[PDB]
Amino acid sequence: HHWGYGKHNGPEHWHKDFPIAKGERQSPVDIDTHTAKYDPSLKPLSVSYDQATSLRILNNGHAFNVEFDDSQDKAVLKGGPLDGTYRLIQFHFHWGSLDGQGSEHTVDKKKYAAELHLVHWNTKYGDFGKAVQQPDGLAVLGIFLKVGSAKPGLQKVVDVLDSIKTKGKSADFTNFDPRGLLPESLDYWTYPGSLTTPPLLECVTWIVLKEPISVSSEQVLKFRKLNFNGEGEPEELMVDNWRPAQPLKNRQIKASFK
Ligand SMILES: N#Cc1ccc(N(Cc2ccc(OS(N)(=O)=O)c(Br)c2)n2cnnc2)cc1
Ligand SMILES: [Zn+2]
Ligand SMILES: [Zn+2]
């Protein structure tokens, strides 16, 4: 009746409504460090988030998202395997029902507690809507979350979740600096892929950081208090909103580090 993450409308069923689910460059994938290829031609990532302007945070029934004002050439991502400039539009997370799972990408089959996705679109296409129709339209920066010490820059996000528990709930969320969610190193793996949720379009250049950020057990626990349902409907906790690894096919994962 609509896609979701349940047993009867989850990832395994998506191909019926979106045939591209069985495509040639689907994401996420397992990053095999035995086969990842170091490429000396890969340039360092250039992240310019000082002018980032957050607007609001909302629960859309798939996860929670923080939206940014991508009107001006404010926060942009460039460098790395990218040609041109990509503007930050929003970020969201994927997590599990327990600390042992939750990430979309995996490294040598290892799953992390959660995964953060910072979504950017190629300015040469004018807007996000036109960018998703192009093979090089989007660039998503993926960051793994491991459980350990708390991440100070994430607390503002965690504390506001109590106010957007159900689908449709939103809350003003201005002055949030995404630089507080980045790890020390920007070394990365990159490969051509797709959106991990329907419509599953193959328009993404994936940039997955090698270094995960540490978040406390208390912080991740708050993620699991959200609901997939809207206020008034049967309670269904928002957990395990991740897609399993897909076939690598004829693709090569490149590493920016030796
Ligand atoms: N049709 C359609 C459609 C679906 C989702 C969006 N996203 C949110 C969004 C959600 C998932 C996503 O893919 S992912 N998991 O980051 O790989 C990406 Br990439 C972007 N969105 C919302 N506002 N800016 C982007 C936009 C259009
Ligand atoms: Zn080996
Ligand atoms: Zn995502």
Q: Which residues of 247-257 are buried (b: 16+ CB within 10 A; e: fewer)?
A: ebeeeebbbbe
Cβ of 195 closer than 6 Å to ligand 1, yes or no, is yes
- 94 known ligand binder: yes
Quick check: is 13 catalytic? no
Domains and CATH numbers, the chain: 1-258 (3.10.200.10)
Say how many Å lie between the CA of residue 196 and the centre of ligand 3: 6
Nearest to 93 by CA among 101, 104, 77: 104
Cβ of 138 closer than 6 Å to ligand 1, yes or no, is yes
Q: At a CB cut-off of 8 Å and minimum separation 6, what does 218 contact?
A: 150
Say how many Å lie between the CA of residue 191 and the centre of ligand 2: 20
Resolution in units of Å: 1.8
Rounded CA separation 77/95 (Å): 25
Question: What value, to the nearest 5°, has the Cα angle with vertex 30 and ends 248 and 66?
Answer: 105
Are the C-beta atoms of 166 and 229 separated by less than 8 Å?
yes
Q: What is the DSSP letter of 228?
A: S
Pairing of strands 213-215, 138-147: parallel
Q: What share of the chain is helix, strand, coil (3-state, %, to 5)?
A: 15, 30, 55
